[PDB]
Structures are given as structure tokens and as C-alpha cells.
């Protein structure tokens, strides 16, 4: 039960499954897209701990259109060596501090397949975060959500 516009936006954001997470750079275009898909996603500001934990545990890269675990720096160097990204550490740096090749760095990472949160969601999940649900902008509370979901 997804409307065509929200479904198209989530496809373009690569959020095609429940409990899937992606990194985006916040501009006017992405802000308006997230506004349209507000009832179906949560988003917020991740910190360094969340970014590094995501890329270390759930870090999967897209090489030859295949989901390959980031178990070695050679894979990252092969995929993003032209952008001076040779390791998981500078991949984390590019994701955290939005640099020049953020588009390539974020697209190389396969969307994170998070588990169901430990402890569950709130009492009602499909209300806005302001109303007491788990939808829309939650600011730094995305860090707690990712911690439970990782």
C-alpha cells in the first residue's frame, strides 16, 4: 500500500525494503523528497560512532553489481581508488564529512540491511516522531535507532 510517488522516491533513494538504511547529503532536492516520503521513513543526523559501526559491521560494497562485504581495504581501493579512497577509514571520512566524491562513495556502499530494533519501536510505529511515533525527522535520535537496529 505505497502511493506511486512515494514508491518512486524510495526506489530512487534505494530504500526498497523495510529496515534498510542509506546515507544522503541534505540539500533542497533531498529535503523535499524526504518530506514527501515522511510517513514511510525516518531520518536524522548520524554521528561518527554510528557511521563507523555501520560501515564496519554492515559495510557492503557494490562491485560488478554485486554485494561484497568490506572485509579488506583492497576492495575499497579497487572501487574508489580514483577518488583517493583506499581504505574503510577514508571511506568513513568521505561519508561523515561530505567531500567531493560523496556521490560515488555513497553509491558504492550497498544499502545497509538493518535488523529489527532490539527493544522494539514505540507503541505505535507509523505516527510521526513528534506525535510519539517512529516516522519523520528525529534529529540525533537516529543514532539510538541505529544502535538498536544494528
Partner 1 sequence: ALKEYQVVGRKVPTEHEPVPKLFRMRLFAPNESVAKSRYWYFLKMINKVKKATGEIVAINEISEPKPLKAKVFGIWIRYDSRSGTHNMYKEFRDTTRVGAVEAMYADMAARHRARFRSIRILKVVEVEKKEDVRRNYVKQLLNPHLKFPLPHRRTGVVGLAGKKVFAPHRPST
Partner 2 sequence: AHVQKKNPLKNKAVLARLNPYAKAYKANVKLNTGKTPKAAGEKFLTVLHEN
CB burial string 59-78: b at 16+ within 10 A, e below: bbbeeeeeeeebeeeebbee
Q: Is the dihedral of CA 36, 125, 15, 8 positive or negative?
A: negative
Binding of partner 2 by 134 (CB under 8 A): no
Q: Is the dihedral of CA 145, 45, 76, 56 positive or negative?
A: negative
State in angstroms the smallest separation of the CB of 144 from RNA.
Answer: 14
State in angstroms the smallest separation of the CB of 47 from partner 1.
Answer: 16
Beta bridge partners of 12: none
Enumerate residues 16-55 that contact RNA by CB under 7 A.
17-18
- Among RNA, partner 1, partner 2, none, the one that 117 touches (CB under a kind-dependent 5 to 8 A) is RNA
Binding of RNA by 115 (CB under 7 A): yes
Q: Which three cell numbers stand for residue 19?
A: 529496515
- Among partner 2, RNA, partner 1, none, the one that 129 touches (CB under a kind-dependent 5 to 8 A) is partner 1
Binding of partner 2 by 89 (CB under 8 A): yes
**Pairing between β-strand 136-139 and β-strand 112-113 as defined by DSSP bridges:** unpaired
According to CB under 8 A, which one of 5, 48, 72, 122 is a site residue for partner 2? 72
**For binding to partner 1 (CB under 8 A), which residues are involved?**
129-130, 137-139, 141
Q: Which is nearer to partner 2, 110 or 129 (CB)?
A: 110
Q: Is the dihedral of CA 33, 34, 35, 36 positive or negative?
A: positive
Tell me phi and psi for residue 65, to 5 degrees.
55, 40
Enumerate residues 64-103 that contact RNA by CB under 7 A.
none
Which x/- pattern over 50-69 shows residues binding partner 2 (rule: CB under 8 A)? ---x--xx----------xx
Amino acid at each position: 500500500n505505497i502511493p506511486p510517488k512515494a514508491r518512486k522516491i524510495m526506489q530512487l533513494l534505494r530504500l526498497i525494503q523495510i529496515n534498510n538504511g542509506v546515507f544522503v547529503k541534505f540539500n533542497k532536492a533531498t529535503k523535499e523528497m524526504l518530506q514527501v516520503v515522511e510517513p514511510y521513513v525516518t531520518y536524522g543526523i548520524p554521528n561518527l560512532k554510528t557511521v563507523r559501526e555501520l560501515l564496519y559491521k554492515r559495510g557492503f560494497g557494490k562491485v560488478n553489481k554485486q554485494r561484497i562485504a568490506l572485509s579488506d581495504n583492497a576492495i575499497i581501493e579497487a572501487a574508489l581508488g580514483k577518488y583517493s579512497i583506499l581504505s574503510i577509514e577514508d571511506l568513513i571520512h568521505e561519508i561523515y564529512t561530505v567531500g567531493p566524491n560523496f556521490k560515488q562513495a555513497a553509491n558504492f556502499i550497498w544499502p545497509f540491511q538493518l535488523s529489527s530494533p532490539l527493544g522494539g519501536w514505540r507503541d505505535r510505529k507509523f505516527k510521526h516522531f513528534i506525535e510519539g511515533g517512529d516516522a519523520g525527522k528525529r534529529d540525533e535520535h537516529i543514532n539510538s535507532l541505529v544502535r538498536k537496529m544494528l
